[PDB]
Amino acid sequence: SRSAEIFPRDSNLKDKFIKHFTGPVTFSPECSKHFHRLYYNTRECSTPAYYKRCARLLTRLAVSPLCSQT
Numbered sequence: 140s141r142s143a144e145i146f147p148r149d150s151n152l153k154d155k156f157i158k159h160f161t162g163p164v165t166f167s168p169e170c171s172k173h174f175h176r177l178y179y180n181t182r183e184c185s186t187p188a189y190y191k192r193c194a195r196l197l198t199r200l201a202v203s204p205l206c207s208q209t
Contacts, residue, residue: 164197164201
């Protein structure tokens, strides 16, 4: 049993909510792999209650050197 902070029922809802909370993450080709890793392998981005934790860790990936292309 893991609490759903959201109201509607959808798969892409998780990505939608998170991307609205984090903003333009804009993950690089490298960060696409790193995204799939920390999204599907962590409890943070697996659990709908851990939306806040997932938001921190996805933003942290987006500010990591491999994503942050200036």
